[PDB]
Design a binder for these strands. Structure first.
Ligand SMILES: [K+]
Lengths: 80, 85, 105, 106, 35, 135, 125, 80
RNA sequence: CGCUGAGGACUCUACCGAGCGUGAGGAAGUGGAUGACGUCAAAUCAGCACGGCCCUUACAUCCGGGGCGACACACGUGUUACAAUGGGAGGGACAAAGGGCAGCUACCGGGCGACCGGAUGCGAAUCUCUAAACCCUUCCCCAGUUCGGAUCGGAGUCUGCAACUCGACUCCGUGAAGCUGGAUUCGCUAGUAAUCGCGCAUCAGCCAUGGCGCGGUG
RNA sequence: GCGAGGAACCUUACCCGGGAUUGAUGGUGAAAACCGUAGGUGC
């Protein structure tokens, strides 16, 4: 009758703080850090014709897993 | 811009949503019956535009805006999670 | 010699059969396999029976040589005289498979 | 970020909804935005805020062209302090748009 | 205009007789490039 | 940069020659060409010598001495590089069935003291001796 | 017993387990001559043993993942050199004299925007 | 070409007009904009004025035209 | 399988090159981002705003069919080739990043194939999409060829209401110019050039040989 | 191989015509639509 908790967010400090709060709040396995999912967006710097000059933006998703035996905005939970 | 284009897009979306008969005909053969439907009811006439400026090019499905609008909000810190590399 | 065509006598079957108008590499391989002749045999090494088998497979199918030439000419004449878009493109000498001119022939 | 909600792979609708006075999902002097909007409103009603900010370490106030109704466009720096919060405001005067960019380093 | 002349020779003048003022400028450039 | 010993002979000159010979990063192909060429060399001039010794003697024969920048001395590294490049280039230019055969023919000719690479070296020597006054 | 070591080269990773024996080098549950059917690759892998004269004295089990054949062979060579150093610390100067223990950090450069490749540029004209 | 499982694509209204003319037995000219409609054996013997963008090019359908689209006989571009 | 339990791999925390030079011992900087003040009345009123001016029986607005894809030609940027360091046939081996809900599809059955029909798992470190250059054996033996694959004919498969103008892919047939290219001209300096394949954005489908990334050999 | 990182219709601004304002079943029709039961991608 174990419980699986999956936490996703876009700020690593936020995920770590939320996981620590959930752990502190009588047998819970350590938070397993799943591989981070990163996306890169390349956009044109200029609104008109300048193809060479480009800007790069990043969006990261951090995932933690909690196995329990025996919420700040921006964090999605998958309690099951 | 050209608000008539946005009105056209909204009308096309409404006509496409108003769907089940087309799905049933496609599941069957019934191509002669599919010929009878209005052309604006077909989903191929739906074109993705920026949700605020109506720009028909440089679309981004993840955020629903053009590249220029995306760059503006990413620099302004309005899209959560997105940061400059 | 085979269908009125003299083949290269020193070439393998699966290559030398492509010298007939109407047979390529794929058709040559298929013809040899259906006739039961190994494809890596030189033309000069074909037995009389094997040559007969190849000729009989060429017949009854595989419109080749003068028949194919006449068929292609008839198709082109019909296309031109029907006065379709492709017909006028062939009559005037321009690409008709969607290719764009002003840059290439 | 001015928006705080997890919206992975589904940002669009929520972004559109979020887009749809001294104003700065589950001390007006040292505030950049209020300074810029106050300057813009004063310019509508017809820069030297640099002294008002300066316990600010530094403050820069750039004002764009079409100044004072002149035909040409001119940009001025109005640097002060030891500049090494950024706000942008737009004023709709009788001759067009004026851009006021305020940098404040505290 | 712009002469090919291996290395470029570009000039531009704005007037009603640009086709002649540009030629004057380019004559100056060609003489200076002679030696 | 570091140079790996040759797998067969344990030499760096062999690896450098293969590096000059290689196209588009196909070092296995270049090695196969070189080893094959050595095989025809040893099968043809079979000479009270070795297979690699003939190749080394050919490189030494077609190496140049001075180079007109006015004539001046040549560094050993540039000497070796230009010798290898000349051998490979004239082997490519000359006719033949396979690259291994062409290279073997050119190596044998260079050892036997005549060939296009030797003609190039002799011409460079003549052009060098032409300007002895300005030196 | 077992001596553990790891080598890395480009995208290749080699984990080497070394033990007493004679000559069995087994890669991914395959013989060395069957996994690397090239004299150059076999020589690259078995280089440090031939340098230190330790060949015909060990069994090696190798787990390779990632990269191509040359990267994998170089990673295996590095892992074997590190394992030999762990087994006997007095052979470190001999292995350093050939560079078998230096980690080569060369990796594929990222492609840059506005360019066809990492450094190659478009034809300006 | 068109998949054989869907059959041929023929404009239903235009075909209905053609069969109505066939049943009547009269002769006239049928004005159409259906350039993509395939020519069927029922079309033979009639005159169909096909739109090309700014005029109606008249086509007299013969047996060799069966299987061709109506737009192949009404060119849209003028060159000289 | 029970387990691994930290040898890798994941994330998150702490670190590590210290010099007139050399030097030993030790694993031993590069790429990108950020551009003070000046210049081009440089580019964008068709991304978005915005002063002025000009349109209301029309420069506003809905629809169908055309066009943006035409070709005497010229210029620019690329992709294939002109072959032996190569082209076919058969077999063996090695990646990384990234994508996936009407989507990727295990596994069966049909078709030469593009694909189709049942069925399974997966909103996914769990289930799926991912190699080629390379190696081995063999043929072609210097030819406009077993090089090249443009053009054209036929038959199909998908998407879509619809593939004529004007789609992609598949299977037959046909098989052109091209024998390494003058004056001139461009890029790059190490995991780089060169070469090989893989993935993504937009996207019903796709003219994707373009753009943005990844690894292999080097 | 620049806006364009997806022009068959749509996109689409351009052209030719068919309409409409000045902001439930039938018949006809290519559709829009018809008949009965502010805005401007204009300067
Ligand atoms: K579309």
């Amino acid at each position: 009758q174990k419980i699986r908790i999956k936490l996703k967010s876009y700020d690593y400090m936020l995920v770590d703080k939320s996981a620590e709060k959930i752990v502190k709040t009588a047998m819970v396995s350590g938070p397993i850090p799943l591989p981070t999912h990163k996306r890169i967006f390349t956009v044109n710097r200029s609104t008109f014709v300048n193809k060479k000059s480009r800007e790069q933006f990043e969006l990261s998703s951090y995932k933690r897993l909690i196995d329990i035996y025996n919420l700040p905005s921006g964090v999605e939970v998958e309690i099951k | 811009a050209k608000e008539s284009m946005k009105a056209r897009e909204v009308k096309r979306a409404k006509l496409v949503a108003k769907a089940a008969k087309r799905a049933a005909l496609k599941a069957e053969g019934n191509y002669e019956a599919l010929q009878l439907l209005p052309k604006n009811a077909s989903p191929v006439r739906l074109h993705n535009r920026c949700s605020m400026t109506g720009r028909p090019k440089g679309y981004m499905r993840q955020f629903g805006i053009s590249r220029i609008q995306f760059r503006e909000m990413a620099s302004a810190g309005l899209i959560p999670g997105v940061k400059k590399a | 010699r085979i269908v009125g065509v003299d083949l290269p006598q020193n070439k393998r079957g699966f290559i030398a059969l492509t010298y007939i108008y109407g047979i390529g590499r794929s058709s040559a391989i298929t013809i040899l396999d259906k006739a039961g002749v190994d494809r890596d045999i030189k033309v000069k090494d074909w037995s009389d029976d094997q040559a007969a088998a190849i000729r009989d497979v060429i017949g009854a199918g595989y419109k080749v040589e003068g028949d194919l030439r006449s068929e292609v000419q008839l198709n082109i004449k019909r296309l031109m005289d029907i006065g379709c878009y492709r017909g006028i493109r062939h009559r005037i000498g321009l690409p008709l498979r969607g290719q764009s001119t002003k840059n290439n022939a | 970020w001015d928006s705080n909600w997890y919206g992975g792979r589904k940002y669009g609708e929520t972004l559109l909804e979020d887009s749809r006075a001294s104003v700065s999902r589950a001390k007006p002097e040292l505030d950049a935005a209020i300074v810029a909007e106050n300057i813009a409103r004063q310019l509508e009603g017809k820069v030297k805020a640099i002294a008002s900010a300066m316990g600010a370490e530094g403050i820069k106030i750039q004002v764009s062209g079409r100044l004072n109704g002149a035909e040409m466009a001119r940009s001025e720096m109005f640097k002060e302090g030891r500049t090494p919060d950024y706000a942008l405001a737009e004023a709709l005067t009788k001759v067009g748009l004026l851009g006021i960019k305020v940098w404040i380093c505290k | 205009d712009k002469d090919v002349a291996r290395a470029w020779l570009f000039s531009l003048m704005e007037a009603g007789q640009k086709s002649s003022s540009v030629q004057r400028r380019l004559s100056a450039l060609k003489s200076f490039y002679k030696y | 940069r570091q140079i790996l010993p040759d797998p067969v002979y344990g030499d760096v000159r062999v690896t450098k020659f293969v590096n000059h010979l290689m196209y588009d990063g196909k070092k296995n192909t270049a090695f196969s060409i070189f080893y094959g060429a050595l095989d025809i060399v040893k099968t043809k001039h079979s000479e009270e010598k070795s297979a690699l010794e003939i190749w080394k003697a050919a490189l030494d024969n077609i190496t140049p001495q001075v180079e007109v920048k006015v004539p001046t001395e040549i560094r050993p590294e540039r000497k070796e590089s230009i010798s290898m490049k000349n051998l490979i280039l004239y082997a490519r230019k000359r006719g033949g069935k396979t690259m291994a055969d062409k290279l073997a023919a050119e190596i044998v000719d260079a050892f036997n003291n005549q060939g296009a690479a030797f003609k190039r070296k002799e011409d460079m020597h003549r052009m060098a001796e032409a300007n002895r006054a300005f030196a | 017993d077992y001596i553990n070591a790891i080598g890395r080269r480009k995208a290749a990773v080699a984990r080497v387990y070394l033990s007493e024996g004679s000559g069995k080098i087994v890669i991914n549950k395959r013989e060395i001559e069957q996994y690397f059917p090239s004299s150059i690759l076999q020589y690259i892998v078995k280089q440090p043993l031939l340098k230190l004269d330790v060949a015909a004295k060990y069994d090696i089990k190798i787990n390779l993942r990632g990269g191509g054949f040359k990267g994998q062979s170089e990673a295996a060579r590095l892992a074997i050199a590190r394992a030999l150093v762990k087994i006997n610390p007095d052979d470190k100067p001999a292995l350093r004299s050939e560079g078998f223990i230096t980690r080569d950090p060369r990796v594929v450069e990222r492609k840059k925007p506005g360019r066809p490749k990492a450094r190659k540029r478009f034809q300006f004209s | 070409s068109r998949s054989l499982k869907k059959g041929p694509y023929i404009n239903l209204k235009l075909e209905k007009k053609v069969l109505a003319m066939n049943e009547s037995g009269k002769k006239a000219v049928i004005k159409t904009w259906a350039r993509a409609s395939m020519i069927s054996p029922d079309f033979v013997g009639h005159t169909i004025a096909v739109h090309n963008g700014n005029k109606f090019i008249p086509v007299f359908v013969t047996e060799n035209m069966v299987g061709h689209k109506l737009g192949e006989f009404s060119p849209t571009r003028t060159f000289r």
